[PDB]
Amino acid sequence: DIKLFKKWSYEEINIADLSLVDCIAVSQKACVYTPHTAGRYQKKRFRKALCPIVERLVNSMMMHGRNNGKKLKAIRIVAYAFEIIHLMTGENPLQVFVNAVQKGGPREDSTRQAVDVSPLRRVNQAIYLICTGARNAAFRNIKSISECLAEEIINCANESSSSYAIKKKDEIERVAKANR
Amino acid sequence: RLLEPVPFVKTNNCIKDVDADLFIRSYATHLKLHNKITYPKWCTFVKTGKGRKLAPLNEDWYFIRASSILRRLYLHPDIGVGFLRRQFSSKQRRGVAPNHTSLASGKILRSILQQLENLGYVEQNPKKKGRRLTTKGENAINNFARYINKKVYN
Amino acid sequence: QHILRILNTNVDGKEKVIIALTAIKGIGKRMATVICKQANVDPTKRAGELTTEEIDNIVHIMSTPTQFKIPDWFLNRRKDLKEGKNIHVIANQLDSYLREDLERMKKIRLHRGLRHHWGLRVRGQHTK
Amino acid sequence: EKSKLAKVEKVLGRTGSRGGVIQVRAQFGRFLIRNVKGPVREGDILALLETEREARRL
Amino acid sequence: KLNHAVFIVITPSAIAEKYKVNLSVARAVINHLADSQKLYT
Amino acid sequence: KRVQTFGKKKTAVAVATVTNGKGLIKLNGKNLDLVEPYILKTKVYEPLWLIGSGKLKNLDIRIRVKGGGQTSQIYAIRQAIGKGIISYYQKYVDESTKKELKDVLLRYDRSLLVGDTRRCEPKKFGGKGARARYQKSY
Amino acid sequence: IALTSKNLRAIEKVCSDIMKGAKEKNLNVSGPVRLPVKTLRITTRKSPCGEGTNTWDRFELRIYKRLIDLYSQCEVVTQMTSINIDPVVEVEVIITDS
Amino acid sequence: VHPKKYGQGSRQCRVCSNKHAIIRKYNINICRQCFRERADIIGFKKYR
RNA sequence: UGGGGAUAGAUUAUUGCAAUUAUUAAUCUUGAACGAGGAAUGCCUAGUAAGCAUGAUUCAUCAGAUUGUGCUAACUACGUC
RNA sequence: GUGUCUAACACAAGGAAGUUUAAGGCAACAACAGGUCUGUGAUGUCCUUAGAUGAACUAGGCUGCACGCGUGCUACACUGA
């Protein structure tokens, strides 16, 4: 049926938080043969859910200064990153990426008090955390951004404390718990 | 990367079937092998445009550029030198001030244009603007297109 | 052996030959590129495996442009003022000559000379 | 550590002084009330790391 | 730092780490092995 | 014979000419192969999979492109191919087959059936953007 | 025959008049060809002393050009033109036909 | 006298003779402060 | 660091009676601070925001300005006092 | 569905579009001793009006520079040159 880059099967499911499975691009109409379709994804409150998660991941990658407007490059970075993950372990990179996004999402957050977190927001934060961590790793270092993203994803998927996303999630939850 | 399977039919005989860079380099190499083209002398020293400041850093660049011009000729029929200067344009970093567009060097273009004409591959007519292609050159481009097309295919 | 040094005791050697040469003078890099071509050495090669003869040739080309196909518009120190032409002074001699020019301007009195004496920018720093 | 998937029963109201929080009632069996950040509606599922204290009704 | 000299999974950064060398030196090792960005798969 | 459609995203317009033929696809003077960006290559390969080879094999498609940059032009081309495929099956083949085909296209996405609704908002004095303004100060 | 005006209604009135006028001598006409609109645009700062928020307004003098042409002898078209005229529109006659 | 054929003194607002803010676009030669009075009688209308 | 282009020297051009407070232009060389910005504080919700350009305005001579125009196409609530 | 089940609102479907479709223009009442007499043969009063504060012409000056604060541009690299 539909395979990413004509390669990745991406029909396999992940158990996750159930709500998170609803949010990620499990659905057939959210799947595409190569990234990017760009519908109107601000319009209604839950409209963002309908976006392909790979489209969201590339958009997050496209963020920040010099990166802005380089959508194809963000697609190339994720494609390269998927190749790297496949080499590092023979698992499907998209499935690994869903595991990393599932792992990265914070359960509680802190306010002026402490609160639970939207599953759509948890995905949005997780992708944000993983990409920001990748940028931090990239900037003025040997590792390419594709490598950093792959490395961050595998560590986050594993549930390593060396992940920037896991470390930030742990700290965010720990401070929330500390207050309440 | 080099070749992918696709379902649709293609023309299979023109530059409109060809990888531009591969074609440009191959024809430039063929032309240099033939030895019809000359650099010549002074053109080793020159700069290619003030938007660059530098030069291509390849030593076979003039032949490449000549070949690249010949491809533009196949696309655009009756074009002239000001069109060429504009074609090869880029941005120029103005120091601290913002960029503005900057032409390629006009003598190298003019020299190629003249050289191709001397070697009979193009013809300036009294009609219209500048130089268009000669049939022998077109048939050769088609033959090289055919060689590449076979080479990828099998 | 492998990271041998360069002109006027500079320790460059894992730099590419162009990059080493530019790290003397010529770091608009057109100068280095033409010198590299006049020498006919590979610009991709690393500096510390040149023999002394290649270096001497390069120093000769840089020092004396006269017997090479280098045009006047390209040249360092293009006309040099007085009726007796001189060209391509370069390096510490250029720096010394430029100091002499600023001294000469000052003695004569020119606005630029006078500004150099004051310690003011020629193009001007503009209010601030 | 401990956590429970709890199913959103009723969305009660927008809370916090600047309105960014939402009060939400969650179903086990048992109803719990908790406060949620970001977009959420009835039939969603809360993470529920802390499985004890009910948030005060507004 | 010290990761640069002339004499002694496919991807240049790993090679540059492994032998402690530049990415140019890694690429040259890749080219010797074979006998923008590129496809190592 | 001939049937005609078009596609329109931002400035860009791609007109599709679908004639009775044999499986050729052109973009102006140029073969479909010469789109160039790999992502946008897939974007125009997408409808080819949705209608398969044997329904393509008795029609030739020629497309004529004016305006916009590459990403907009390719989406206009993709829309023109979608509408083009449907128009041929509505004029020559059958309404039922056309409905069956349209269902497939709809299942993939809406964007090759219905064009974009986004269009530029004019610049207004007091800032570089449409809405974005120069900095206030005290 | 080319018609240029800054007023839509006057040019359209002339259109109906020329259509009738042509049919009076039963002439063979090519349908009225509306040429691309030119707008004389001035984007003007508000305030004579340049006060307050900068504030610009965009003024337009929009001229309409149209062409209707006829295969007929030179005398007939000039005489038709002289009966058909009104003061406001700018008329040009380019017909050398027979 | 000693005349100057170009630059600031070569031109003026046709209406008021002032040398400032002159619209030379389309060869109007009126300063905008004068022009905005007359732009309607000249035939312009604003819409945007 | 081959990032950066401040700063300076040597040219031949261009507009003009006049360029000499580097007018403007290019050529070669010259290679400063600056390792992503403290206290503070600006603008922004869908083709927007951001990046990237360019036309017009002044103009004999000149865009780092203003005003338009496009292409590349984000994030995040989607509301609260 | 909700709403006195009134004016009306909410969601989904249909639809190119569903908030007044998105963007402009026009902008009351009543003020401000806001700005503009260096835009105007709009203009009161006051100064001055031929060793003229008019007209005109030659230079120099408006970019000066121990220094302070606004607004913008360009950078600090490898998703880059």
UniProtKB/TrEMBL annotation, chain B:
<keyword id="KW-0687">Ribonucleoprotein</keyword>
<dbReference type="GO" id="GO:0022627">
    <property type="term" value="C:cytosolic small ribosomal subunit"/>
</dbReference>
<dbReference type="GO" id="GO:0003735">
    <property type="term" value="F:structural constituent of ribosome"/>
</dbReference>
<comment type="similarity">
    <text>Belongs to the eukaryotic ribosomal protein eS19 family.</text>
</comment>
<protein>
    <submittedName>
        <fullName>40S ribosomal protein S19</fullName>
    </submittedName>
</protein>
<dbReference type="InterPro" id="IPR001266">
    <property type="entry name" value="Ribosomal_eS19"/>
</dbReference>
<dbReference type="GO" id="GO:0003723">
    <property type="term" value="F:RNA binding"/>
</dbReference>
<dbReference type="InterPro" id="IPR036390">
    <property type="entry name" value="WH_DNA-bd_sf"/>
</dbReference>
<dbReference type="InterPro" id="IPR036388">
    <property type="entry name" value="WH-like_DNA-bd_sf"/>
</dbReference>
<dbReference type="GO" id="GO:0000028">
    <property type="term" value="P:ribosomal small subunit assembly"/>
</dbReference>
<dbReference type="InterPro" id="IPR018277">
    <property type="entry name" value="Ribosomal_eS19_CS"/>
</dbReference>
<keyword id="KW-0689">Ribosomal protein</keyword>
UniProtKB/TrEMBL annotation, chain D:
<dbReference type="GO" id="GO:0000028">
    <property type="term" value="P:ribosomal small subunit assembly"/>
</dbReference>
<protein>
    <submittedName>
        <fullName>40S ribosomal protein S28e, putative</fullName>
    </submittedName>
</protein>
<dbReference type="GO" id="GO:0022627">
    <property type="term" value="C:cytosolic small ribosomal subunit"/>
</dbReference>
<dbReference type="GO" id="GO:0006412">
    <property type="term" value="P:translation"/>
</dbReference>
<keyword id="KW-0687">Ribonucleoprotein</keyword>
<dbReference type="Pfam" id="PF01200">
    <property type="entry name" value="Ribosomal_S28e"/>
</dbReference>
<dbReference type="InterPro" id="IPR000289">
    <property type="entry name" value="Ribosomal_eS28"/>
</dbReference>
<dbReference type="InterPro" id="IPR028626">
    <property type="entry name" value="Ribosomal_eS28_CS"/>
</dbReference>
<dbReference type="InterPro" id="IPR012340">
    <property type="entry name" value="NA-bd_OB-fold"/>
</dbReference>
<keyword id="KW-0689">Ribosomal protein</keyword>
<dbReference type="GO" id="GO:0030490">
    <property type="term" value="P:maturation of SSU-rRNA"/>
</dbReference>
<dbReference type="GO" id="GO:0003735">
    <property type="term" value="F:structural constituent of ribosome"/>
</dbReference>
TrEMBL record, chain G:
<keyword id="KW-0689">Ribosomal protein</keyword>
<comment type="similarity">
    <text>Belongs to the universal ribosomal protein uS10 family.</text>
</comment>
<feature type="domain" description="Small ribosomal subunit protein uS10">
    <location>
        <begin position="1"/>
        <end position="94"/>
    </location>
</feature>
<dbReference type="GO" id="GO:0022627">
    <property type="term" value="C:cytosolic small ribosomal subunit"/>
</dbReference>
<protein>
    <recommendedName>
        <fullName>Small ribosomal subunit protein uS10</fullName>
    </recommendedName>
</protein>
<dbReference type="GO" id="GO:0006412">
    <property type="term" value="P:translation"/>
</dbReference>
<dbReference type="GO" id="GO:0003735">
    <property type="term" value="F:structural constituent of ribosome"/>
</dbReference>
<keyword id="KW-0687">Ribonucleoprotein</keyword>
UniProtKB/TrEMBL annotation, chain H:
<dbReference type="InterPro" id="IPR039744">
    <property type="entry name" value="RIbosomal_uS14_euk_arc"/>
</dbReference>
<feature type="binding site">
    <location>
        <position position="13"/>
    </location>
    <ligand>
        <name>Zn(2+)</name>
    </ligand>
</feature>
<dbReference type="GO" id="GO:0008270">
    <property type="term" value="F:zinc ion binding"/>
</dbReference>
<keyword id="KW-0862">Zinc</keyword>
<comment type="similarity">
    <text>Belongs to the universal ribosomal protein uS14 family.</text>
</comment>
<feature type="binding site">
    <location>
        <position position="34"/>
    </location>
    <ligand>
        <name>Zn(2+)</name>
    </ligand>
</feature>
<dbReference type="InterPro" id="IPR001209">
    <property type="entry name" value="Ribosomal_uS14"/>
</dbReference>
<protein>
    <submittedName>
        <fullName>40S ribosomal protein S29, putative</fullName>
    </submittedName>
</protein>
<dbReference type="Pfam" id="PF00253">
    <property type="entry name" value="Ribosomal_S14"/>
</dbReference>
<dbReference type="GO" id="GO:0002181">
    <property type="term" value="P:cytoplasmic translation"/>
</dbReference>
<keyword id="KW-0687">Ribonucleoprotein</keyword>
<dbReference type="InterPro" id="IPR043140">
    <property type="entry name" value="Ribosomal_uS14_sf"/>
</dbReference>
